[PDB]
Amino acid sequence: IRVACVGITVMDRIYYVEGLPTESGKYVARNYTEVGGGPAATAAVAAARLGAQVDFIGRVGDDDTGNSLLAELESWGVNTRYTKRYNQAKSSQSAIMVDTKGERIIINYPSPDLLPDAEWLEEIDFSQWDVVLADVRWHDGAKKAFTLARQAGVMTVLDGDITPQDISELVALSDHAAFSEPGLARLTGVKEMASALKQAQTLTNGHVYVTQGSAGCDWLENGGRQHQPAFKVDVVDTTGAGDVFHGALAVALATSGDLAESVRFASGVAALKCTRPGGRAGIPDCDQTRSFLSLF
Amino acid sequence: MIRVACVGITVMDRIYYVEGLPTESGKYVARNYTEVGGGPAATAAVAAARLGAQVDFIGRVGDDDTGNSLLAELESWGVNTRYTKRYNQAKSSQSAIMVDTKGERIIINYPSPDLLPDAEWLEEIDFSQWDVVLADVRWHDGAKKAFTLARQAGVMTVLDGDITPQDISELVALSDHAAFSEPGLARLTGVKEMASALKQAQTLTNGHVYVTQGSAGCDWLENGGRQHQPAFKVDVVDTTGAGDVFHGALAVALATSGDLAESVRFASGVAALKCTRPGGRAGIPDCDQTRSFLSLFVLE
Numbered sequence: 104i105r106v107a108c109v110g111i112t113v114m115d116r117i118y119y120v121e122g123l124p125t126e127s128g129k130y131v132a133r134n135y136t137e138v139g140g141g142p143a144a145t146a147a148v149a150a151a152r153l154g155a156q157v158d159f160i161g162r163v164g165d166d167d168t169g170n171s172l173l174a175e176l177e178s179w180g181v182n183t184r185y186t187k188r189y190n191q192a193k194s195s196q197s198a199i200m201v202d203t204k205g206e207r208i209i210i211n212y213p214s215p216d217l218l219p220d221a222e223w224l225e226e227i228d229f230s231q232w233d234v235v236l237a238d239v240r241w242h243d244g245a246k247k248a249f250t251l252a253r254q255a256g257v258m259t260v261l262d263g264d265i266t267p268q269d270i271s272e273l274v275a276l277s278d279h280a281a282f283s284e285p286g287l288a289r290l291t292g293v294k295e296m297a298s299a300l301k302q303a304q305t306l307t308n309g310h311v312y313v314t315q316g317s318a319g320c321d322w323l324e325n326g327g328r329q330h331q332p333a334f335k336v337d338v339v340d341t342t343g344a345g346d347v348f349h350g351a352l353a354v355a356l357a358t359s360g361d362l363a364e365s366v367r368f369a370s371g372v373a374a375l376k377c378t379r380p381g382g383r384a385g386i387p388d389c390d391q392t393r394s395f396l397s398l399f
Numbered sequence: 400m401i402r403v404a405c406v407g408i409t410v411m412d413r414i415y416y417v418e419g420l421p422t423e424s425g426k427y428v429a430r431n432y433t434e435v436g437g438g439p440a441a442t443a444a445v446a447a448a449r450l451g452a453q454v455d456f457i458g459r460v461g462d463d464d465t466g467n468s469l470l471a472e473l474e475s476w477g478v479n480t481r482y483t484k485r486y487n488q489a490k491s492s493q494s495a496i497m498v499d500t501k502g503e504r505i506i507i508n509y510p511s512p513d514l515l516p517d518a519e520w521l522e523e524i525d526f527s528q529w530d531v532v533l534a535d536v537r538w539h540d541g542a543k544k545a546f547t548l549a550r551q552a553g554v555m556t557v558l559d560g561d562i563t564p565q566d567i568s569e570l571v572a573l574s575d576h577a578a579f580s581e582p583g584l585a586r587l588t589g590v591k592e593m594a595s596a597l598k599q600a601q602t603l604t605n606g607h608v609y610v611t612q613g614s615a616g617c618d619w620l621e622n623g624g625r626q627h628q629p630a631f632k633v634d635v636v637d638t639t640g641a642g643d644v645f646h647g648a649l650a651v652a653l654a655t656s657g658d659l660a661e662s663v664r665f666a667s668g669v670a671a672l673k674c675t676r677p678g679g680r681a682g683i684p685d686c687d688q689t690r691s692f693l694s695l696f697v698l699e
């Protein structure tokens with residue numbers, strides 16, 4: 104399966120501290136780790152670990168951070184070839200402080216050097232992939248990549264989360280729009296997930312889904328309400344479950360056109376990742392997955 | 400020509416400019432970011448060099464890109480890095496800094512465990528060759544060695560007594576001048592009332608003790624007497640390394656003048672002028688620009 108992931112890549116700089124700052128002054132971290140993130144980036148890593156030809160299309164700087172981010176993606180088996188590296192530019196990143204009790208302070212810097220312009224996408228031949236997954240954190244890239252992919256007759260999958268911008272026009276370009284409870288609520292202005300999914304369906308000729316963590320995943324199939332329960336597992340690290348689900352769902356939808364099979368498969372990949380520690384290091388492969396899924 | 404040594408830490412500061420300092424947990428958004436070299440002893444050295452002293456920086460760095468960037472910046476400012484130890488396959492230290500609209504800063508330092516605390520290397524160096532040795536409290540074993548050597552040689556010792564996890568009692572005792580921060584002095588004494596604290600601190604050393612209280616200025620004890628130098632009210636632009644620059648200027652002034660009152664005024668001025676001029680280490684004035692700014696106030 105050939106997969107493209109369009110969206111954002113951010114370097115998390117994690118500082119483990121005795122207590123979260125709270126007041127001003129100098130503090131000393133007991134420990135430090137540098138892990139890449141971003142919805143479309145983690146989704147790509149998931150799809151690669153499941154053994155797809157996976158490409159990540161996003162924006163980085165010509166700085167050390169840019170190099171660190173794209174090198175990690177490659178090391179995970181994600182091709183960075185069509186990612187735009189901007190000259191004399193800083194990449195997006197976050198400083199994160201983490202308490203003993205698991206409480207987090209996040210300072211995100213979205214780099215203004217990485218321009219929202221998405222005319223760069225026209226240089227890419229989109230026919231070369233079976234599915235294009237996009238996140239809603241780079242609206243102009245999502246819209247271009249989906250238009251190109253539709254012109255080429257390629258499958259489109261959206262990670263429809265909470266964003267300030269209206270994603271009505273994006274849901275319409277989506278063959279599969281997989282929302283989050285908040286994402287779906289913002290779009291429809293309806294807080295009852297059932298009614299919302301029905302409202303959302305009217306916006307697209309494609310399929311609509313809402314993920315509710317432990318409550319599992321709901322979706323509409325020809326006006327019929329369908330559901331896949333969440334897998335009861337001993338959760339250890341929930342860092343990127345939603346991103347990993349979208350990655351697996353794209354691969355599964357491309358391989359097995361079956362919605363029900365695809366959603367079960369994704370729910371499993373996500374669940375297995377939550378058991379294994381190390382965030383991106385916890386993501387299973389088509390073998391570790393098939394095995395976990397056999398525990399039925 | 401004052402010959403100055405600065406012993407301690409050199410780190411890459413990762414500066415995040417935010418709307419407000421984080422008080423509680425959750426997500427925040429930086430308006431802007433810069434990666435600038437820092438560290439107390441390193442910035443103190445840069446300040447002393449800009450004031451026109453033969454300045455040496457003695458600390459520990461990695462063999463990584465960051466290490467090279469840090470030592471190159473120090474040299475570019477005219478600080479000799481000749482006695483700094485490069486560890487041959489190691490990452491250098493770093494800090495994340497959040498900076499509010501008003502210039503107030505939260506600094507979260509990560510000391511690289513690759514830079515080992517061993518300081519016995521210092522014994523090979525001839526401490527006689529300097530007029531004053533300034534140390535910060537972040538490299539405990541280097542501070543203690545450098546001050547013992549400098550004392551054996553009869554060289555002046557100046558301490559930047561800031562917040563560190565370890566107890567700096569033994570360091571204050573080796574200090575001819577111990578210039579604390581409100582938090583640093585509180586951690587040392589476990590007394591939050593600065594007057595009583597300074598009195599407790601004095602008992603630890605045959606030297607002089609001072610506490611810096613930002614806008615409330617600098618207090619110090621001279622033969623049991625409370626002495627004070629007010630902070631200079633200036634149009635503040637950049638708060639970068641103000642405290643570090645103060646210690647740098649204070650060391651140079653104490654070596655040149657031997658006058659406490661004059662020295663502390665002079666340092667408070669270097670720091671104040673730096674707060675007006677932007678570019679952090681590019682904002683630090685010289686003995687001339689400073690003397691000029693200090694004279695101009697009686698006229699405003």
Ligand SMILES: O=P(O)(O)OC[C@@]1(O)O[C@H](CS(=O)(=O)O)[C@@H](O)[C@@H]1O
Nearest residue numbers: 129437438439494508537640641642
């Ligand atoms: O807050 P000030 O007094 O200006 O000192 C700041 C500084 O010198 O110290 C930090 C490390 S730690 O605090 O010593 O661990 C460095 O990142 C920074 O350059």
